[PDB]
Design a protein around this ligand. Structure first.
Ligand SMILES: Cc1ccc(C(C)(C)C)cc1S(=O)(=O)Nc1ccccc1C(=O)O
Ligand SMILES: Cc1ccc(C(C)(C)C)cc1S(=O)(=O)Nc1ccccc1C(=O)O
Ligand SMILES: Cc1ccc(C(C)(C)C)cc1S(=O)(=O)Nc1ccccc1C(=O)O
Ligand SMILES: [Cl-]
Lengths: 224, 218
């Protein structure tokens, strides 16, 4: 039975899974869950995933409710032996470490910022506070890229797929002018055929956020 | 060379690593980084871990900056063939899925609440708001425990070690009396010899929070 992905492409973690699915040419059934309308609280979806979150993957009996587990599972089943989720223990641990950075730091802070916009309206958000917190994430990623060409080493890994979607979302608001390594890396990610899977949901998120938050992202910020 | 763990045992994720180290008899060099004094910001540690977070593990050339990577790494290096980090793919994915629940949901929400105390003062925290957020996490774990004795299945895994330390920290404020499966699970975890590794840091966190929060837990 082929994998089933419950998804809303506005979510950066969803887009990371879509990028991997395109990159590896995985045949997956897509089932849309509209987060803006609250469909993640439908009784049947809640029973499947009590965290009421996307992405959620159903693959046979296996139910995964975190993008980072979905990325690892799909890499192991469809990029077996490959370099996205590298074979050598230390290289694999490096990728895992950066996946968890994305979960615990970059996504956490972007989520905090974007949900404050939705709850309060942009005009009432402490933007300087969130600018400091997300600039710190930029600094950390710049450090990682000062030591290696991609996030977790010399070649593309799951860490880049996980991080680039949330980075592109942060960068709707906050420019990368002061971060040359992160700009070079982001530009390189944008040249990948798989990055096409990030573009549509990023734009839909931009539209939804501007509407719900009553504001406009500065057009000059996003690297394009 | 033996692993080096940079730690402050007030941190629940740190305590999860301490529990695994005791559980597996890992010879580790502990290096205390006093988070209350901001030692995670001095130049050499920042250069080591720009996230300025504990636990941080240095094992040869490998530098891990997240408790869940540290748990997996130590289980793979020191408990190959064990049930804590099971080899079968579906079981391993299930443990991984719960480790990420701890990171993304349970710890995130407990960190939100505790941060609010430190930043705003306990007297100014919207306790009802955080009670709702953390009770939702209790509800989810109760569902996870519906038909299995542990978080990720019939046996103790890394997921239980990760979750129990944060759970004990949430439980400083919010009791478990309404969640029968979760309360029984927690009592069972407290019977593990390895759980002794959680006790000191939990008490030190309580004391530090009550001092800085200018308050006193229930
Ligand atoms: C991850 C995510 C999914 C869906 C959305 C929209 C439906 C708003 C387009 C936004 C985001 S987001 O990355 O911008 N973060 C939030 C923003 C607002 C509210 C909640 C969150 C959250 O993460 O829970
Ligand atoms: C990460 C951290 C930093 C500083 C502290 C001291 C209170 C000891 C200064 C504790 C922690 S902690 O690791 O002990 N957990 C939290 C406790 C309070 C607020 C936030 C957190 C959190 O992690 O977010
Ligand atoms: C199914 C399996 C069997 C044997 C192994 C090893 C011999 C490599 C331990 C690994 C796996 S696994 O494909 O499920 N592995 C990981 C999953 C999540 C995070 C890290 C790993 C990892 O391998 O380090
Ligand atoms: Cl593989």
């Amino acid at each position: 039975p082929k994998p089933i992905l419950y998804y809303d492409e506005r979510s950066p973690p969803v887009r990371s899974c879509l990028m991997l699915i395109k990159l590896l040419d995985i045949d997956v059934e897509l089932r849309f869950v509209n987060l803006f309308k609250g469909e993640q609280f439908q009784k049947d979806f809640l029973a499947l995933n009590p965290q009421h979150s996307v992405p959620t993957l159903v693959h046979g009996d296996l139910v995964l409710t975190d993008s980072h587990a979905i990325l690892i599972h799909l890499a192991e089943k469809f990029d077996e032996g490959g370099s996205l989720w590298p074979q050598e223990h230390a290289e694999r641990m490096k990728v895992l470490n950066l996946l968890l950075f994305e979960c615990s730091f970059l996504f956490r802070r972007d989520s905090d910022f974007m949900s404050a916009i939705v709850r309060q309206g942009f005009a009432n958000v402490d933007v300087a506070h969130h600018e400091r917190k997300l600039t710190e994430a930029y600094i950390i990623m710049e450090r990682y890229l000062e030591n290696s060409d991609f996030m977790a080493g010399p070649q593309l890994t799951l860490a880049d797929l996980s991080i680039v979607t949330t980075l592109s979302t942060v960068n709707l608001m906050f420019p990368l002018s002061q971060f040359p390594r992160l700009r070079r890396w982001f530009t390189a990610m944008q040249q990948l055929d798989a990055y096409e899977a990030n573009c549509s949901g990023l734009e839909k998120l931009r539209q939804t956020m501007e509407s719900v938050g009553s504001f406009q992202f500065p057009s000059s910020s996003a690297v394009v």
